[PDB]
Design a protein around this ligand. Structure first.
Ligand SMILES: *[C@@H]1O[C@H](CO)[C@@H](O)[C@H](O)[C@H]1NC(C)=O
Lengths: 53, 60, 49
């Protein structure tokens, strides 16, 4: 159920913030980060997808 | 309610000419549906009928 | 001859649904209170304006 990630029209990005500073074609890259939840909760946006393929 | 429109066809907002499985039938035309009906939440319910997808040949 | 137009703007946040501050204006207040009276063996209490 809830199979939604067939429609992920790509935002394919050569990740600049790879290991030891410089760039690599990383799909695990962070694009947006939310921490404003006052309980120390960290909403992190990875450039890859889990769960639904 | 109100009918949705792919710039020539006034279909019901969750019932297009390709009712259902819009992306399986027409992928890039569903992308043009995204480009055209981005104002329309009934189109988003059609997309939900492709997100909770219920195709013809797929029994789910 | 490879160029990149680039574009950005500012929106509201995720917090604005429930978590938000209010620059709020008020003027001349109201005088309400609450009192308990002992009256003929009755600890009885009311609240009024
Ligand atoms: C009535 O209220 C007073 C406090 O105002 C308290 O000292 C007293 O014990 C109370 N008496 C009874 C009978 O409730």
């Amino acid at each position: 159920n809830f199979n939604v990630y067939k429609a992920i029209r790509p935002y394919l990005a050569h990740c600049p913030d790879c290991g030891e500073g410089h760039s690599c074609h990383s799909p695990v890259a962070l694009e947006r980060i939310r921490n404003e939840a006052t309980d120390g909760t960290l909403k992190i946006q990875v450039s890859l997808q889990i769960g639904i393929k | 309610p109100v009918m949705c429109l792919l710039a020539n066809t006034t279909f019901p907002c969750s019932q297009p000419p390709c009712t259902p499985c819009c992306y399986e039938k027409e992928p890039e035309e569903t992308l043009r549906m995204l480009e055209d009906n981005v104002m329309r939440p009934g189109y988003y319910q059609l997309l939900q009928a492709s997100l909770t997808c219920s195709p013809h040949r797929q029994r789910r | 001859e490879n160029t990149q137009l680039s574009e950005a703007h500012v929106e509201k946040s995720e917090s604005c649904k429930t978590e938000f501050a209010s620059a709020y204006r008020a003027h001349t207040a109201s005088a309400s209170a609450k009192l308990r009276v002992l009256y003929q063996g009755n600890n009885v209490t009311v609240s009024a304006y």
